[PDB]
Amino acid sequence: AVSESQLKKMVSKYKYRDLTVRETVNVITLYKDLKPVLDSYGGSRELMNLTGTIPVPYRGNTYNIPICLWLLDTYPYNPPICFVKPTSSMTIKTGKHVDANGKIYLPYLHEWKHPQSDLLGLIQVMIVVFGDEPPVFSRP
């Protein structure tokens, strides 16, 4: 697992460090398949993101939907940039909440406002919305 000490190091360049670490811990504690990763966003600059899967029930079954939540250095004042990350055995379902690049669009992200908006609330919304319209489907 990851420690708060290691997280603080990862967000050293962030404007609101304690707040970002606090929510990250909350998220990875509840969602065991999400992992904090420090990587180059779009190959432009380094940012920490939460990568992995979240459990989403659809038509009676639960799926481990692969996602990636990029936390900007302005987190939590600005919402995260989120993507669905299909494996080779699946395809991105472009639609109301997902564009051609797998980027996620949600009213929750659009009107994001700290402190009423947070990652736990966002993920809860994803589970509900994706449970209605999956962002990815498996190849036949």
Partner 1 sequence: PEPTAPPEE
Tokens of 19: 């707040």
**Least Å distance between CB 127 and partner 1?**
14
- Contacting residue, 3, 12, 44, 61, with partner 1 by CB under 8 A: 61
By CB under 8 A, tell whether 29 contacts partner 1. no
Q: Rounded CA gap, 71 and 47, in Å?
A: 7
53 vs 78, which CB is nearer to partner 1?
A: 53
36 vs 86, which CB is nearer to partner 1?
A: 86
By CB under 8 A, tell whether 105 contacts partner 1. no
By CB under 8 A, tell whether 94 contacts partner 1. no
**Least Å distance between CB 37 and partner 1?**
15
DSSP assignments along the chain, one per residue: ---HHHHHHHTTT-SSHHHHHHHHHHHHHH-TTEEEEEEEETTTEEEEEEEEEEEEEETTEEEEEEEEEEEPTTTTTSPPEEEE---TTEEE--BTTB-TT-BB--HHHHT--TTT--HHHHHHHHHHHHHHS-SEEE--
By CB under 8 A, tell whether 21 contacts partner 1. no
**Least Å distance between CB 68 and partner 1?**
12
- Measured CA to CA in angstroms, residue 60 lies from 32, 44, 56, 95 at distances of 22, 41, 10, 22
By CB under 8 A, tell whether 91 contacts partner 1. yes
Binding region for partner 1 (CB under 8 A) out of 3-11, 18-26, 50-58, 106-114: 50-58
Interaction site with partner 1 (CB under 8 A) = 32-33, 52-53, 58-59, 61, 63-66, 85-87, 89-91, 134, 136-140
